[PDB]
Every structure is written in C-alpha cells, then in structure tokens.
Design a protein around this ligand. Sequence first.
Ligand SMILES: Nc1ncnc2c1ncn2[C@@H]1O[C@H](CSCC[C@H](N)C(=O)O)[C@@H](O)[C@H]1O
Length: 235
Amino acid sequence: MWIGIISLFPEMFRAITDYGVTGRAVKNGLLSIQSWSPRDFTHDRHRTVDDRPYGGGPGMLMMVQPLRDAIHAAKAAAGEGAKVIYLSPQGRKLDQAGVSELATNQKLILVCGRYEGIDERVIQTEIDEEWSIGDYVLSGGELPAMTLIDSVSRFIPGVLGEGLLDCPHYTRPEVLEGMEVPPVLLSGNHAEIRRWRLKQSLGRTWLRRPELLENLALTEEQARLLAEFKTEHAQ
Ligand SMILES: Nc1ncnc2c1ncn2[C@@H]1O[C@H](CSCC[C@H](N)C(=O)O)[C@@H](O)[C@H]1O
C-alpha cells in the first residue's frame, strides 16, 4: 500500500509515521506515505492558501490553484488507478465494511481540507470519492486521513503480526479490588470460553447498540445465548 497526502500540515502525519503498528509498517515498507502541501504551490508573497467564498459566508475556503497543483503533483507521482479521496463530513460514513473496500486499493491519494472546505468544482474534477469519519465536525482532514490510514493498514498482511461489539477482556491479577476474572477464562475449556465471549458480545451489543442487532441475522445458538443474557440481566 502506497498513500499520497495533500495537506497544509504534512508534519501532523508523523503521528502515524513514527508510532505503533503504523510506524512499524512504515519502517518495514508495508506502507509508504508522501505528502504534497498546497503551500509549496503558492505564487504570491504571502503564500496564500485560503480564499473567500462566493455568496458570503463564515469562513474561508482553500484557494483553488495551490490546491489543484498539489493534487496534480500527487497524481503525477502515483499514476493510473490511484483512487483520489476527499475527506469530508459530507462523504460516505466510514465503517468496518467500507474500511474493507478501501483496504482493497494499492494506491490512494487523500485530500485534507482546512477552513470551511474546498470548491465544489475541484471535488467534481479532481476527486473519485468523499469519505467521512463520522457525523460530527472537525476543523481539518488530517485526523480523518490518519484515521482512514490507520484502520485500513490493519488489513495489510505484514501489519498486524462481523456485526457485534467485542466482549470484555481480563489480564493479571486474578482479583483486582475484590473483582475476579470470570472463572470460565481461567478453566481451559475452549468452547465454554468461546461461548462466554459470544454471549457477552451479544449482550453488550443489545445493551449499547441495539440497532446493530437488527441488521444481523442471528443463528439459533446466538438467539439462545442472547435470550439467556437478557434473562440473567433482569436479575
Ligand atoms: N467528519 C469529518 N470527516 C472527514 N473530514 C472532516 C470531518 N470534519 C471535518 N473534516 C475535514 O476538515 C475540513 C473542515 S470542516 C468543513 C465543513 C464544511 N462545511 C464542509 O462542507 O466541508 C473539511 O474540508 C474536511 O476535509
């Protein structure tokens, strides 16, 4: 996987380039990242990158020419089949399934807005798809870009060595403040353990995200474990 970045603050990406799973993938070559900043495509003395919006409005928009030039340069480095993504609260809402679709590309170019955004005609001319990390607003496309890169990298084979929320987890000591590790975790029974996990997963998804379960086709075993969870919950 190759990733080109267009952003006014390339340095922010160090958060993904130098730490954890992501930094190691990068140091090992599973992942590469280059960035072109619109600031280096500026022609004026003040290096201008924002511009006024037609029709009035609150903020600024990214100046079009320095933005397009930065995008063109990433396009030139990357070539054919490099999907251009614009991070935007107006794009498709990201979820594990879309992360899957994205992880399927070998080359991506991510476009990071600042201010109130980018010119509609640049989106229509330069971008293949818009993606949002969630129904809320950030002041930049960097975190969203890094978020996209992080979740997707987890699918590349050397990076790490289905409907429900995960179950609770436990690790040393066996009793922490009078609270014990559920005894099944301590038995060695592979299936009694797997059963407790699926059951806790079903119950948590019910308690916290009942709507995920409605989009799930449960097996009879899952229905029984849920029904069983719901019952020992009324106690
Ligand atoms: N939830 C979210 N997902 C992805 N990008 C987001 C985001 N919130 C903000 N951004 C990024 O940061 C910028 C500033 S906020 C922009 C909101 C503007 N009303 C909209 O039309 O664009 C956008 O250009 C976007 O790239």
